[PDB]
């Protein structure tokens, strides 16, 4: 399989790269605004009740639909990563350079953070919820959950969008990528929160001023995404 | 990026333009009939309860599915705007002429209004609900919410349907456009109502004889749509 | 626009036509089995409660997904009508011959009826629910509801599947056709039941031995479907 | 129609075949992890309540989305069967060799079982639920339910993915295949559980150490899948 490529500053500062960074910022902002917004909407409707099944459905569907769109609207400009773990898994398989990937991370983190401060305002100052592992459940269980579900996501990105042999999968790729996240929130929501996405988790941690447990949402997703890049890149593109 | 184009009467009165106006009328009627209808259905089932999470899901899914369809069924005739803010954002980027755009607005407003009078009849005279900003929440918060979510919609229309480089996105564009509205209602419903669409809001205001607060659903969506046209048109098509 | 074509017996008894009839039987059986089945599932889970919002969502989503599939799996064999009103609207615009269309009706009615007797068995003898206009609501209101929502469906079939200029819409047509039915059930369920489909309504009327009010689900859908054929066929294909 | 083909060891041990087996393992693992996971999520949220309508929706949507993805991500490597009954129905119509098909079964069963042991861990040791026929309902009713719904699935796979004349259906095939399972769970969940898939059922039986009634989920799905292969393969591909 293709090796890691560090890239160059010239390449990573080209106008095409700059457009890509803006696209990643915008896609991540819009994804996180909707997705976090659905969780705040549930809190508003229920006066801050514990999550129930209708709420889980609302939040999962919102994230799946919004991520489909966020990926689609960047696909021809940046590739529509919307997610540091996607960028990382792609970098592991030589699909994006390291330098460009770092700038994608910055754009994604900025976009997510912006979305969360916008939410705080437009909702009239409601709390921005953070991802956390369920009460009582171990952190390793949470990490392993996040490894598995993020592996699923990044593997999907490889199979439908990166693979040169994708064929007609390329047309439906944004939808597959969004709806694997939706599906996986329906499973993982009550356990890890169903992040799959360090930026999605980071914005709220900034806006709520609370990084307790936040490491889970870097370690788990990066390992899952990296494992997907290693497996798909070496076996199915190698 | 392309400038605003005023157009001509000859062009805007051509048979092709007249077909486009009828298509916009029909698509907007069917979109608003379903979407408002889902809100009246919730009121019927619950005896006019406050919105809850099942209801929000029902209404969001209905709007997302219905808008997907309404866009698809006009895509090859009018472009499937279904929305004055989409038309406006496209006009800002030179994608539709101003004169033609004004006639699209008329067709959309007429279609929405018609849908709402039809609903009043077929439901046995139930109230046609109007979009309003949540009790206690400021109007600027509501406007800014609508700016953000309408920006998302119009940006999606640009990226998937207008951009000449859309490629395979063009096939899934109607679905992206519908499901961003669905996603954004799941976030915004309990705050602004999740309009994104001055015509969707206007029909009910006419049918309920209540324009209180209605300005929000012109100012917010037009600004969001205009900002999407400015950004995408000048950066990603320029 | 194209006129009505009566067709011929030779044509309507060809092997291609016979395959089409079997495909319509199978698609309609599978559509109605799922869709009615979701309503029986709700009754089982709730001990025959009145419809609530979760139930409406379940039933609407089931029908939208199932109809998408039923249309897709016949699209290249029969055209995937799955619905006497679709067949009728297509016949009005010269898209299927009258003789072939009558045999499609028979196949659809048989498939729906079969599904409903299968359901009665596999559910352990539970009642097969019938479409009815809501208590107190007038029959004309119910008919007009069904006209509007069936117009939407058949117009969608024309715009995405019949029109020679459909282009990329043809790829997503089955999904548009399914999800307009889903959307429209979210609106119409508590009022007319959201049929759009004389066969979908007829199977249960046979299996429950109850044709009270059943005429609504022929008059409303046939008029809507016929109006869609007249408008689209003469304006947008003429 | 094409006959059954036994195949060869050389063919079934080729690198292409080995890649296919890994893809089937991964797709089935990810499908079952999400889908079973959604059922465990419901149990967590509700403290092990009986299934209700929100829960049925959550579980059906999760399975439909996850299966769409699992099929898509194997489509160009293995064909994306994810299901012994799909493999069997395809084998009946000569679309996969018997030897290769047996190895697909092994990969699918292993993947499902792995998913279920992973779930047991990451959820903090919660019970892995098994498919069972509803209390009081006969086993033949359960089998016949599973025949019908699995026929639907495998017929969909033939019509959209196997048929050489699939045309544009091939692009949307993964989505049709996923959403027929979603639809059919909305009908069958409270009666048979809505399996359609011997591997999906088998993983939990292993992880819960409970094979009571499990035969239903081999007999019903294999017969349905085999009947779909016989009908579609001989009539619509013959």
Of A79, A59, A77, the closest CA to residue A174 belongs to A79
CA-only gyration radius of chain D, Å: 17
In D207-232, which positions are buried (b, 16+ CB within 10 angstroms) versus exposed (e)? Answer: beeeeebbebbbbbbbbbbbbbbebb
3-state secondary structure of D89: helix
- What whole-number distance in Å separates Cα of residue D221 and Cα of residue D223? 5
- Chain A touched by D72 (CB under 8 Å): yes
- What whole-number distance in Å separates Cα of residue D118 and Cα of residue C187? 41
Would you give the distance in Å from CA B184 to the centre of its chain?
A: 12
In B168-186, which positions are buried (b, 16+ CB within 10 angstroms) versus exposed (e)? Answer: bbbbbbbbbbbbbbbbbbb
Interface with chain B: mutation pick from A65, A77, A79, A117, highest number of B CBs within 10 Å: A65
Contact assignment for A65 to B166 by CB distance below 8 Å: no
* Contact between residue A187 and residue A194 where contact means Cβ atoms under 8 Å apart: yes
- What whole-number distance in Å separates Cα of residue D20 and Cα of residue D82? 11
* Contact between residue C92 and residue C86 where contact means Cβ atoms under 8 Å apart: no
- Chain D touched by A176 (CB under 8 Å): yes
Residue C26 distance to chain D (closest CA, Å) = 9
Tokens of D26: 């991964």
Residue C90 distance to chain D (closest CA, Å) = 21
Phi then psi for residue A222, to 5 deg, are -65, -40
- Chain D touched by C40 (CB under 8 Å): yes
Return all residues near A10 (Cβ < 8 A) that are at least 6 apart: none
Contact assignment for B124 to C136 by CB distance below 8 Å: yes
* Contact between residue B83 and residue B62 where contact means Cβ atoms under 8 Å apart: no
- What whole-number distance in Å separates Cα of residue D142 and Cα of residue D146? 6
Chain D positions touching A60 (Cβ under 8 A) are 58, 61-62
Chain A positions touching B54 (Cβ under 8 A) are 54
Please list the helix, strand and coil fractions of chain D in percent, rounded to the nearest 5, in that order.
Answer: 70, 0, 30
Chain A positions touching D54 (Cβ under 8 A) are 52-54, 57
Chain A positions touching D26 (Cβ under 8 A) are 155, 231
Look at phi and psi of residue A51 and say left if phi exceeds 0, alpha if psi is from -120 to 50, else beta. Answer: beta
- What whole-number distance in Å separates Cα of residue C149 and Cα of residue C170? 21
- What whole-number distance in Å separates Cα of residue C92 and Cα of residue B31? 25
- What whole-number distance in Å separates Cα of residue A165 and Cα of residue A171? 13
A partners (3+ CB pairs within 8 A) are: B, D
Q: Other CB atoms closer than 10 Å to residue D117's CB: what's the count? A: 13
In terms of C-beta density within 10 A (0-12 exposed, 13-18 middle, 19 or more buried), how is residue D100 classed? buried
- What whole-number distance in Å separates Cα of residue D108 and Cα of residue D203? 9
CA-only gyration radius of chain C, Å: 17
- What whole-number distance in Å separates Cα of residue A76 and Cα of residue A70? 12
- What whole-number distance in Å separates Cα of residue B75 and Cα of residue C158? 13
As a whole number of Å, the end-to-end CA separation of chain D is 5
- What whole-number distance in Å separates Cα of residue D115 and Cα of residue D36? 9
Question: What's the per-residue H, E or C state across D25-63?
Answer: HHHHHHHHHHHHHHHHHHHHHHCCCCCCHHHHHHHHHHH
Chain C positions touching B124 (Cβ under 8 A) are 134, 136-138, 141, 191
* Contact between residue B227 and residue B147 where contact means Cβ atoms under 8 Å apart: yes
- What whole-number distance in Å separates Cα of residue B35 and Cα of residue B193? 12
Nearest CA in chain C to D134: C123
Residue D3 distance to chain C (closest CA, Å) = 21
Return all residues near A16 (Cβ < 8 A) that are at least 6 apart: none
Selecting from D52, D57, D180 the residue whose C-beta is nearest the C-beta of C69 gives: D180
* Contact between residue D15 and residue A163 where contact means Cβ atoms under 8 Å apart: no
Selecting from B57, B159, B183 the residue whose C-beta is nearest the C-beta of A73 gives: B159
Return all residues near B224 (Cβ < 8 A) that are at least 6 apart: B85, B89, B146, B147, B148, B149, B150, B151, B152, B153, B154, B196
- CA B116, B118, B123: angle at the middle one, nearest 5? 95
Q: Other CB atoms closer than 10 Å to residue B164's CB: what's the count? A: 7
- For chain C, breaks with the C atom over 2.5 A from the next N come after none
* Contact between residue A28 and residue A70 where contact means Cβ atoms under 8 Å apart: yes
Tokens of C122: 């596999």
Tokens of B102: 């004004």
- What whole-number distance in Å separates Cα of residue A75 and Cα of residue B46? 42
Q: Dihedral sign for Cα A10, A13, A15, A17, please.
A: positive
Would you give the distance in Å from CA C63 to the centre of its chain?
A: 10
Contact assignment for D74 to A159 by CB distance below 8 Å: yes
* Contact between residue C106 and residue C15 where contact means Cβ atoms under 8 Å apart: no
- For chain B, breaks with the C atom over 2.5 A from the next N come after none
- Chain B touched by A121 (CB under 8 Å): yes
As a whole number of Å, the end-to-end CA separation of chain B is 5
* Contact between residue D178 and residue A172 where contact means Cβ atoms under 8 Å apart: no
Selecting from B54, B172, B235 the residue whose C-beta is nearest the C-beta of A72 gives: B172
| Distances D206 to A8, D19, D85, D104, D134 between C-alpha atoms, Å | 52, 26, 19, 18, 20
Tokens of A118: 């916008």
B partners (3+ CB pairs within 8 A) are: A, C
Selecting from B172, B180, B187 the residue whose C-beta is nearest the C-beta of A38 gives: B187
- What whole-number distance in Å separates Cα of residue D58 and Cα of residue A193? 15
* Contact between residue D143 and residue D219 where contact means Cβ atoms under 8 Å apart: yes
* Contact between residue A13 and residue B24 where contact means Cβ atoms under 8 Å apart: no
Residue B209 distance to chain A (closest CA, Å) = 27
- What whole-number distance in Å separates Cα of residue B222 and Cα of residue C1? 39
Q: Other CB atoms closer than 10 Å to residue C238's CB: what's the count? A: 9
Nearest CA in chain B to A26: B152
- CA B72, D186, D175: angle at the middle one, nearest 5? 40
Tokens of C195: 């049929």
Chain B positions touching C179 (Cβ under 8 A) are 65, 68-69
Q: What is the DSSP string of D191-228?
A: TT-----HHHHHHHHHHTT--TTTTHHHHHHHHHHHHH
- Chain C touched by B222 (CB under 8 Å): no
CATH architecture of A1-238: Up-down Bundle (1.20)
* Contact between residue C108 and residue C219 where contact means Cβ atoms under 8 Å apart: no
Q: Other CB atoms closer than 10 Å to residue B229's CB: what's the count? A: 30
Contact assignment for D76 to A167 by CB distance below 8 Å: yes
Phi then psi for residue C61, to 5 deg, are -65, -45
* Contact between residue A58 and residue A41 where contact means Cβ atoms under 8 Å apart: yes
Interface with chain D: mutation pick from C68, C69, C169, highest number of D CBs within 10 Å: C69
- What whole-number distance in Å separates Cα of residue B154 and Cα of residue B136? 29
- What whole-number distance in Å separates Cα of residue B75 and Cα of residue B55? 30
What does this entry list as its resolution, in Å?
1.2
Tokens of A208: 């709520």
Q: How many CA atoms lie within 13 A of D20 on its CB side?
A: 24
Tokens of B5: 């184009």
Contact assignment for A182 to D33 by CB distance below 8 Å: no
Contact assignment for B34 to C183 by CB distance below 8 Å: yes
Q: How many CB pairs under 8 A join A and B?
A: 139
Question: What's the per-residue H, E or C state across A49-64?
Answer: CCCCHHHHHHHHHHHH
In terms of C-beta density within 10 A (0-12 exposed, 13-18 middle, 19 or more buried), how is residue B165 classed? exposed
3-state secondary structure of B163: coil
Of D117, D133, D135, the closest CA to residue D189 belongs to D133
- What whole-number distance in Å separates Cα of residue B62 and Cα of residue B78? 23
- What whole-number distance in Å separates Cα of residue C85 and Cα of residue C153? 9
* Contact between residue C171 and residue D172 where contact means Cβ atoms under 8 Å apart: yes
| Distances C59 to A41, A64, D60, D205 between C-alpha atoms, Å | 24, 21, 12, 30
* Contact between residue D72 and residue D179 where contact means Cβ atoms under 8 Å apart: no
Contact assignment for B152 to A69 by CB distance below 8 Å: yes
Tokens of B19: 């077909």
Selecting from B42, B69, B76 the residue whose C-beta is nearest the C-beta of C156 gives: B69
Of C136, C115, C118, the closest CA to residue C197 belongs to C115
Tokens of A202: 């980071």
Contact assignment for B171 to A174 by CB distance below 8 Å: no
- Chain A touched by D116 (CB under 8 Å): no
| Distances D209 to D27, D202, D213 between C-alpha atoms, Å | 23, 10, 12
Residue D155 distance to chain A (closest CA, Å) = 21
Of D91, D103, D114, the closest CA to residue D26 belongs to D114
Return all residues near B149 (Cβ < 8 A) that are at least 6 apart: A33, A34, B184, B187, B188, B192, B194, B196, B224
Tokens of C221: 């859908």
Tokens of C7: 């067709």
Of A227, A231, A235, A65, the closest CA to residue A148 belongs to A227
DSSP letter for C28, please: H
Tokens of C139: 């029959």
| Distances C202 to B112, C28, C83, C120, C217 between C-alpha atoms, Å | 32, 12, 11, 15, 8
Tokens of B26: 């029909």
Helices then strands, counting H and E runs in chain B, come out as 9, 0
- Chain B touched by C61 (CB under 8 Å): yes
**Pairs from A108-111 (Cβ < 8 Å, separation ≥ 24):** A108/A24, A108/A25, A108/A28, A108/A81, A108/A82, A108/A83, A108/A84, A108/A199, A109/A84, A109/A199, A109/A202, A109/A203, A110/A25, A110/A28, A111/A24, A111/A25, A111/A26, A111/A27, A111/A28, A111/A29, A111/A32, A111/A199
CA-only gyration radius of chain B, Å: 17
Would you give the distance in Å from CA A93 to the centre of its chain?
A: 18
- What whole-number distance in Å separates Cα of residue D206 and Cα of residue D112? 10
Contact assignment for C175 to B171 by CB distance below 8 Å: no
In terms of C-beta density within 10 A (0-12 exposed, 13-18 middle, 19 or more buried), how is residue C235 classed? middle
- What whole-number distance in Å separates Cα of residue D87 and Cα of residue D154? 9
Return all residues near D131 (Cβ < 8 A) that are at least 6 apart: D192, D193, D195, D200, D201, D204, D214, D216, D217
Residue B161 distance to chain C (closest CA, Å) = 12
Of A14, A157, A4, the closest CA to residue A81 belongs to A157
DSSP letter for B96, please: S
* Contact between residue D122 and residue A145 where contact means Cβ atoms under 8 Å apart: yes
Residue A2 distance to chain D (closest CA, Å) = 18
- Chain B touched by C230 (CB under 8 Å): no
Would you give the distance in Å from CA C120 to the centre of its chain?
A: 21
Chain A positions touching B52 (Cβ under 8 A) are 45, 54
- What whole-number distance in Å separates Cα of residue D92 and Cα of residue D5? 9
3-state secondary structure of D13: coil
Interfacial C residues in 149-168 facing B (CB < 8 Å) = 149, 151-152, 155-156, 159-160, 163, 165-168
3-state secondary structure of B223: helix
Residue with tokens 């001990």: C47
- Chain C touched by D193 (CB under 8 Å): no
Q: What is the DSSP string of chain A?
A: -PPP----HHHHTSHHHHHHHHHHHHHHHHHHHHHHHHHHHHHHHHTSPPP-HHHHHHHHHHHHHHHHHHHHHHTTTT----SHHHHHHHHHTTSS-HHHHHHHHHHHHHHHHHHHHHHHHHTTS-------PPTT--HHHHHHHHHHHHHHHHHHHIIIII-TT-TTHHHHHHHHHHHHHHHHHHHHTTTT-----HHHHHHHHHHTT--TTTTHHHHHHHHHHHHHHHHIIIII--
- What whole-number distance in Å separates Cα of residue C38 and Cα of residue D53? 10
- Chain A touched by B60 (CB under 8 Å): yes
Contact assignment for D187 to C118 by CB distance below 8 Å: no
Question: What's the per-residue H, E or C state across chain B?
Answer: CCCCCCCCHHHHCCHHHHHHHHHHHHHHHHHHHHHHHHHHHHHHHHCCCCCCHHHHHHHHHHHHHHHHHHHHHHCCCCCCCCCHHHHHHHHHCCCCCHHHHHHHHHHHHHHHHHHHHHHHHHCCCCCCCCCCCCCCCCHHHHHHHHHHHHHHHHHHHHHHHHCCCCCCHHHHHHHHHHHHHHHHHHHHCCCCCCCCCHHHHHHHHHHCCCCCCCCHHHHHHHHHHHHHHHHHHHHHCC
C-alpha dihedral, C50 to C56 to C59 to C62, nearest 10°: -160
Tokens of B172: 């899934």
Q: How many CA atoms lie within 13 A of D99 on its CB side?
A: 12
Q: Other CB atoms closer than 10 Å to residue B121's CB: what's the count? A: 13
Contact assignment for D191 to C42 by CB distance below 8 Å: no
* Contact between residue B197 and residue B220 where contact means Cβ atoms under 8 Å apart: no
Angle formed by the axes of helices D98-122 and A139-157, nearest 10°: 140
Selecting from D22, D45, D75 the residue whose C-beta is nearest the C-beta of A235 gives: D22
Return all residues near C149 (Cβ < 8 A) that are at least 6 apart: B33, B34, C184, C187, C188, C192, C194, C196, C224
- What whole-number distance in Å separates Cα of residue C224 and Cα of residue C234? 15
Tokens of D163: 């048929």
Residue with tokens 């229920």: A46
Of B179, C185, A152, C69, the closest CA to residue D178 belongs to C69
Residue A13 distance to chain B (closest CA, Å) = 16
Phi then psi for residue B46, to 5 deg, are -110, 5
| Distances A49 to A54, A75, C53, C237 between C-alpha atoms, Å | 12, 37, 19, 54
In A139-153, which positions are buried (b, 16+ CB within 10 angstroms) versus exposed (e)? Answer: eebbbbbbbbbbbbb
Q: Which method resolved this structure?
A: X-ray
- Chain C touched by D134 (CB under 8 Å): yes
């Amino acid at each position: 399989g293709a090796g890691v490529a560090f890239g160059s500053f010239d390449d990573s500062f080209s106008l095409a790269s700059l457009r890509a960074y803006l696209a990643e910022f915008i896609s991540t902002l819009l994804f996180v605004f909707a997705g976090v917004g659905s969780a705040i909407a549930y809190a508003k409707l229920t006066s801050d009740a514990a999550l129930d099944t209708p709420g889980l459905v609302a939040i999962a569907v919102c994230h799946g639909f919004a991520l489909f769109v966020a990926v689609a609207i960047g696909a021809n400009i940046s590739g529509g990563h919307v997610n540091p773990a996607v960028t990382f898994g792609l970098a592991v398989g030589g699909q994006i350079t390291v330098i460009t990937g770092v700038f994608y991370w910055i754009a994604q983190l900025l976009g997510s953070t912006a979305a969360c401060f916008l939410l705080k305002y437009v909702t009239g100052g409601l709390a921005v919820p953070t991802h956390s592992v369920a009460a009582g459940l171990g952190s390793i269980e949470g990490v392993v959950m996040e490894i598995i579900i993020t592996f699923a996501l990044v593997y999907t990105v490889y199979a439908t969008a990166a693979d040169p042999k994708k064929g007609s999968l390329g047309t439906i790729a944004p939808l597959a990528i969004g709806l694997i996240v939706g599906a996986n929130i329906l499973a993982a929501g009550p356990f890890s929160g169903g992040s799959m996405n360090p930026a999605r988790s980071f914005g709220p941690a900034v806006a709520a001023g609370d990084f307790s447990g936040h490491w889970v949402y870097w370690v788990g997703p990066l390992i899952g995404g990296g494992l997907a890049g290693l497996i798909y890149g070496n076996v199915f593109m190698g």
